[PDB]
């Protein structure tokens, strides 16, 4: 059950960010993965996302929910390094919370604290 960091080496990830930032300078590179213990949400179709740098976290969350085709009654949370602010621009989350490899990592679940 290998996560993205386990499938690609640290060097491969650093190199991937460098090139994708050079080719897509208006986009934030984001890794979005499902919580390993998740039991009721579907898995996403892909792992690596490019998010425009005028978008905020509230907007991203609604977009991902829609990708998963969730019913209104279904809980969804998006965690950036374990913390569950919706208004923050994804550029600012990136500057603050990006990994040493340069990706911004997120995990989604139907629980908010996990776990």
């Amino acid at each position: 059950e290998k996560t993205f960091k386990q499938r690609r080496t640290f060097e491969q990830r650093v190199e991937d960010v460098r090139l994708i930032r050079e080719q897509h300078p208006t986009k934030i590179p984001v890794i979005i993965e499902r919580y390993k213990g998740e039991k009721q949400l579907p898995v996403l179709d892909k792992t690596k996302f490019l998010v425009p740098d005028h978008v905020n976290m509230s907007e991203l969350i609604k977009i991902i929910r829609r990708r998963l085709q969730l019913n209104a009654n279904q809980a969804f949370f998006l965690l950036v390094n374990g913390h569950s602010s919706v208004s923050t621009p994804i550029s600012e989350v990136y500057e603050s919370e990006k990994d040493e490899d340069g990706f911004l990592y997120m995990v989604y679940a139907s629980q908010e604290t996990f776990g």
């Binding site: 892909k46 792992t47 490019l50």
Partner: peptide, 12 residues
């Protein structure tokens, strides 16, 4: 997994 492609997210 398709680690070789990025989804390009845009506002609707």
């Amino acid at each position: 997994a398709d680690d070789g492609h990025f989804v390009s997210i845009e506002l609707e």
